[PDB]
């Protein structure tokens, strides 16, 4: 047999990259996964080069970041990468979830895969948030403070878990040090989760924009979809350069460049942009315990989605009503993200409550109701 199959290591590399029988009808959206993996490398790569200079002490975290920017040779490049690349990591992850929601990539044969997806999502958010707390700017510190205060709402253990998180009585040196350690670490746990993701993908393969089985026409991957992966990768890197080199702080918040001071809260507290939607949900629910439960449900209800989707046809590409519902859901998610950064004001409190209501109603009402209606409509129309 060829060396690319006889050797176990090259056999694995072949099974996943060179001969993976990808369907012939996959759009460019299926490239997002590769980008995500690429980003996972970049986050790690630049990340490993920031810890070589980052000092996790609370009195040195911000000064250490500025030392990276000003003193290290390419330190500005490494930091701007590690940050805007996280922003792009979440852009690609949201696009990868949107693709999996539009096309029924979460349906039966791949439910397991979907589950790891969700877990990855959850884990990633933690990592990102934790990493952000390492900068220890104003917004960094106060985001950590708000997060821990909200987690203080667990019924009984809440009063005791928070000191274990803080490592003290407030966000301080132990908190930043443990965040740095767990932030260096959890990316490798996420790499393991990504390996599990790829295994669950390889067991049943990838879906199609048409939804129908691809087994009738499948293509290798080395001459096909590796050179499509290169288009997607180079577009990603071109936009990533337009951000990193030109206007690299657009995605960040200026207040993060003011060193953290517990005695002065900044005018507004917002997470980094990609966590804004969930933050909005958190504020839509008045109760703190209610808010945290509702938020974690907003993330976990993706697990319920494969069972609430009563559609006989995989995917939305051939479904009229479901496409409208999906785009309405996407735009409501963007609206939630927008409301996340806006102050809790007269119209916005009610608008955010309604947006959260519809966000959950999507999964638990609209997807099942619309899917059933469209099944009946398909059968009646053909007859």
């Amino acid at each position: 047999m060829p060396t690319r199959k006889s050797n176990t290591y090259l056999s694995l590399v072949n099974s996943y990259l060179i001969d993976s029988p990808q369907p012939s009808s996959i759009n460019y959206w299926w490239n997002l996964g590769s980008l995500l993996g690429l980003c996972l490398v970049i986050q790690i790569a630049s990340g490993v080069f920031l810890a070589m200079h980052y000092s996790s002490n609370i009195e040195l975290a911000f000064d250490s970041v500025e030392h990276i920017m000003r003193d290290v040779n390419a330190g500005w490049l490494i930091r701007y990468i590690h940050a805007n690349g996280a922003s792009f990591f979440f852009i690609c992850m949201y696009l990868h979830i949107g693709k999996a929601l539009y096309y029924g990539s979460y349906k039966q044969p791949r439910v397991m895969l979907w589950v790891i997806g969700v877990v990855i999502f959850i884990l990633t958010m933690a990592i990102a948030f934790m990493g952000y707390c390492l900068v220890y700017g104003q917004m960094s510190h106060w985001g950590a403070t708000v997060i821990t205060n909200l987690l203080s709402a667990i019924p009984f253990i809440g009063n005791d878990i928070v000191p274990f998180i803080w490592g003290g009585f407030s966000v301080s040196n132990p908190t930043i040090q443990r965040f740095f350690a767990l932030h260096f670490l959890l990316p490798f746990i996420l790499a393991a989760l990504v390996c599990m993701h790829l295994m669950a993908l390889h067991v049943h393969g990838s879906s199609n924009p048409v939804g129908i089985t691809g087994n009738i026409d499948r293509l290798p991957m080395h001459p096909y979809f590796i050179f499509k992966d290169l288009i997607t990768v180079f577009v990603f890197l071109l936009i990533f350069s337009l951000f990193v080199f030109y206007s690299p702080n657009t995605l960040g918040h200026p207040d993060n460049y003011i060193p953290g001071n517990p005695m002065v809260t900044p005018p507004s507290i917002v997470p980094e942009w990609y966590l804004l939607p969930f933050y909005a949900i958190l504020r839509s629910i008045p109760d703190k315990l209610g808010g945290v439960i509702a938020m974690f449900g907003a993330i976990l209800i993706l697990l319920s989605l494969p069972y609430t989707d009563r559609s006989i046809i995989r995917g939305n590409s051939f479904k009229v009503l479901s496409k409208l519902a999906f785009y309405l859901f996407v735009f409501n998610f963007i609206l939630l993200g927008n409301l996340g950064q806006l102050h809790v004001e007269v119209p916005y409190i009610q608008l955010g409550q309604f947006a959260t209501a519809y966000y959950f109603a999507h999964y638990i009402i609209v997807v099942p109701v619309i899917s059933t209606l469209e099944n009946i409509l398909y059968y009646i129309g053909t007859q």
Binding site: F164, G167, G168, P174, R178, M263
Partner: protein, 137 residues
């Protein structure tokens, strides 16, 4: 092994800033550094403690009461800022003659509530758990 995550000596102790309650005189500023921030406190005077008990919480726009504010009766405290946005606290000035939010000249009551002036919300309490003949924060 998970006990490492918990407050570390240098934190379990030292973080709780025990200070003698008896030393403070009733009328003056016993301005203290606590929770790594200002921690100003006055052991309550007998007349002042009584005056507060009589004062109606409903009368104040702020929804707070002296009884909830003070854990140990005579001994209590506030963290370091007269106004909701930090205002260095002046002593014995304001609507009730308790403190002046000098940064805006706003009025802080003996209660410490945002009695008047720019404070968006009433002044917070530096770890309010002071007890016995000592304080702690």
């Amino acid at each position: 092994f998970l006990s490492s995550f918990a407050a570390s000596a240098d934190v379990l102790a030292m973080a709780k800033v025990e200070v003698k309650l008896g030393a403070i005189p009733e009328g003056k500023n016993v301005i203290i550094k606590w929770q790594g921030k200002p921690v100003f406190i006055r052991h309550r005077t007998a007349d002042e403690i009584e005056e507060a008990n009589q004062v109606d919480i409903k009368t104040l726009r702020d929804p707070q009461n002296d009884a909830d504010r003070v854990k140990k009766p005579e001994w209590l405290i506030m963290l370091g800022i007269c106004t909701h946005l930090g205002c260095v606290p002046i002593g014995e000035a304001g609507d009730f003659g308790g403190w002046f939010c000098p940064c805006h000249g706003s009025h802080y009551d003996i209660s410490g509530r945002i009695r008047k002036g720019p404070a968006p919300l009433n002044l917070e309490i530096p770890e309010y758990d002071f007890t016995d003949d000592e304080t702690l924060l």
